[PDB]
Design a protein around this ligand. Structure first.
Ligand SMILES: O=C(c1cc(CO)ccc1Cl)c1c[nH]c2ncc(-c3cnn(C4CCNCC4)c3)cc12
Length: 272
């Protein structure tokens, strides 16, 4: 209703975006809207959720969060451009080693530590929401499902949701730790657990089986298996916080972020 639209209109910038930005080039299509490149920036063209998202993004700037630049009123959102694409492209088309996985996990944990200390829960951590820079920069985006703080809304993407979310229990920031654990499984196996199943049967599987099992756990080092176990603990109090996990031994084997640029080149070659 008009009252929420007025609040949204008071938040967006005024002036012609067609006059501030040039060289529009379409680079994608999805559920939300159409993504363009301009001058380098990335512009997504598409109620109370759009307000929460713009507000949370302006208020929570961090080097491990894609920079929100501007918005215009149908609704255009201007972000920094990360030319290396998404982590999804890398996870589905390449074999990442433990040093590369640890580098990505560390970057994601730094973004989560920042968010959780600012009482923000992302609730939609997945490889699709991780953007890569041409230098190997790792950044988090899509704050549409975020909540400012316990919660009990069944919010997220089925395959990456924590059991306490799926079962509609009072939950906290550690739901993002579980989702990161699922994203580390994506990095290992190419997919989150139960992707072959329909989203509802995955929800039942998360609620009944709990901690998912790896297809080949013997292939992982002892320190990596432990890191995953701390991410995917059933008991929320036992599950590690972002601050605690930043000190885990697994992150000490992290390779420089430059080690990710051959993966970006491989993903770009596979998806052409
Ligand atoms: O999309 C968003 C976005 C997200 C939100 C969150 O709601 C808000 C607003 C925006 Cl503008 C991006 C923000 N910065 C980006 N930097 C790079 C890319 C990028 C690079 N390559 N690709 C594609 C993937 C499909 N295949 C062809 C290549 C996309 C996308 C964005």
């Amino acid at each position: 209703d008009e009252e929420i639209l007025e609040k949204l209109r008071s938040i967006v910038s005024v002036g012609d975006p067609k006059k501030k930005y040039t060289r529009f080039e379409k680079i994608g299509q999805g559920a939300s809207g159409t993504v363009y490149t301009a001058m380098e920036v990335a512009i997504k063209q598409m109620k109370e959720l759009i307000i929460n998202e713009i507000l949370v993004m302006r208020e929570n700037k961090n080097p491990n969060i894609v920079n929100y630049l501007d918005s215009y009123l149908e609704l255009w959102v201007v972000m920094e451009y990360l030319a290396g694409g998404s982590l999804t492209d890398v996870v589905t088309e390449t074999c990442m080693d433990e040093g590369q996985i640890a580098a990505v996990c560390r970057e994601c944990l730094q973004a989560l530590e920042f968010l959780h200390s600012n009482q923000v829960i992302h609730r939609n951590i997945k490889s699709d929401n991780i953007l890569l820079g041409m230098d190997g920069s790792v950044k988090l985006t899509d704050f549409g499902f975020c909540a400012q703080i316990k919660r009990s809304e069944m919010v997220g993407t089925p395959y990456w949701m924590a059991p306490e979310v799926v079962t509609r229990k009072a939950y906290g920031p550690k739901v993002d730790i579980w989702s990161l654990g699922i994203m580390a499984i994506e990095m290992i196996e190419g997919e989150p657990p139960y992707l072959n199943e329909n989203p509802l049967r995955a929800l039942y599987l998360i609620a009944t089986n709990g901690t998912p099992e790896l297809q080949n756990p013997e292939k992982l080092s002892a320190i990596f298996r432990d890191f995953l176990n701390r991410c995917l603990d059933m008991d929320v109090e036992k599950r590690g916080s972002a601050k605690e996990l930043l000190q885990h031994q697994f992150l000490k084997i992290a390779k420089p972020l430059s080690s990710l640029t051959p993966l970006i080149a491989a993903a770009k070659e596979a998806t052409k």
